[PDB]
Amino acid sequence: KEIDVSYVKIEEVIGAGEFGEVCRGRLKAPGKKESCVAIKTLKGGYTERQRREFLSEASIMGQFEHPNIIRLEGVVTNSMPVMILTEFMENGALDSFLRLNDGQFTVIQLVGMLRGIASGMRYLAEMSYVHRDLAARNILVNSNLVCKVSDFGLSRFLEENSSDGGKIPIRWTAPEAIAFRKFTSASDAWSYGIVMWEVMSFGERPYWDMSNQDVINAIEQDYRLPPPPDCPTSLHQLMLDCWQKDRNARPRFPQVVSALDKMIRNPASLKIVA
Ligand SMILES: NS(=O)(=O)c1cccc(Nc2nccc(Nc3c(Cl)ccc4c3OCO4)n2)c1
Ligand SMILES: [Mg+2]
Ligand SMILES: [Mg+2]
Ligand SMILES: [Mg+2]
Ligand SMILES: [Mg+2]
């Protein structure tokens, strides 16, 4: 959906993306009430390939409609700067948000965040979309703490293309995906276990200071991340389920959502901690 630039007001620069600024603004279109939007801008000096890659995120977002997937409002393509407008997520990226708020949300709140992410992923999997970069940094959080999946793009990773999309995010990536480049919803479930860990640790770095090769070797040698401090054992177990080496043994996302829904219904179960 092409948006008349007269309908957009940019208020403030709030971040930086791959190709430019991320801004907060207002969208007001005839017959609709004004709303808050995030706006990515692309200014002068990029190649047409770069323009296409930038706008591809909009094309992909626009294929989806789900409360846990970032909503596209529209694009500005007949004018400079080129823009992508989405719903505005007041609290930004989940990893940074949790680090700011370390120890300040309850286990039940954290599980609700995890449930929203898992519902987004359930939907993407149903739509046969493999995310491939599922990480807390790619989860955006609104004022009501609703978590939504972001970062959409279909470009192959640099390792997949010519001998001579960016690099595979090793610490989030399932071993078979690293080894063979087979990305599936089941490799996303692995990544989701890593997101669970990031959430229950209030945004700590998966595998701390381990190198990417250290991580690859550790996982092959049966190492798995330990329960974060105060983490309910049942959540750690679901993490371990996501991190099975055999991808077919991992839970699919409907199962992940169910498990989380049970926990919310049965909060006493969350009291068991190592
Ligand atoms: N807490 S804060 O107000 O300082 C802040 C900072 C950065 C981003 C925020 N929300 C924020 N909300 C929605 C989206 C977004 N970034 C973004 C992505 Cl990830 C993809 C595509 C796109 C985007 O903006 C429009 O087009 N960001 C909020
Ligand atoms: Mg991606
Ligand atoms: Mg990415
Ligand atoms: Mg990317
Ligand atoms: Mg801590």
From Swiss-Prot:
Tissue-level expression: Abundantly expressed in placenta but also detected in kidney, liver, lung, pancreas, skeletal muscle and heart. Expressed in primitive and myeloid, but not lymphoid, hematopoietic cells. Also observed in cell lines derived from liver, breast, colon, lung, melanocyte and cervix.
Active site: D133 (proton acceptor)
Residues bound to ATP: I14, G15, A16, G17, E18, F19, G20, E21, V22, K40
Domain Protein kinase: residue ranges: 8-274
Post-translational modification: Phosphorylated; autophosphorylation is stimulated by EFNB2.
Effect the entry attributes to changing R250W: In CMAVM2; the mutant protein is not detected by Western blot; loss of localization to cell membrane
Ranges facing Cytoplasmic side: 1-274
Residues modified to Phosphoserine: S162, S163
Reported effect, L260P: In CMAVM2; uncertain significance
Subcellular location: Cell membrane
Disease: Lymphatic malformation 7: A form of primary lymphedema, a disease characterized by swelling of body parts due to developmental anomalies and functional defects of the lymphatic system. Patients with lymphedema may suffer from recurrent local infections. LMPHM7 is an autosomal dominant form with variable expressivity. Some individuals present with severe non-immune hydrops fetalis, which may cause perinatal demise or fully resolve after the neonatal period. Others present with no edema and have milder clinical features, such as atrial septal defect or varicose veins as adults. Capillary malformation-arteriovenous malformation 2: An autosomal dominant disorder characterized by multiple, round to oval or more irregularly shaped macules that are pinkish red in color and are randomly distributed across the body. These capillary malformations are associated with either arteriovenous malformation, arteriovenous fistula, or Parkes Weber syndrome.
Function: Receptor tyrosine kinase which binds promiscuously transmembrane ephrin-B family ligands residing on adjacent cells, leading to contact-dependent bidirectional signaling into neighboring cells. The signaling pathway downstream of the receptor is referred to as forward signaling while the signaling pathway downstream of the ephrin ligand is referred to as reverse signaling.
Name of this chain's protein: Ephrin type-B receptor 4
Species this chain originates from: Homo sapiens (Human)
The encoding gene: EPHB4
Portion of the parent chain present: 608 to 888 of 987
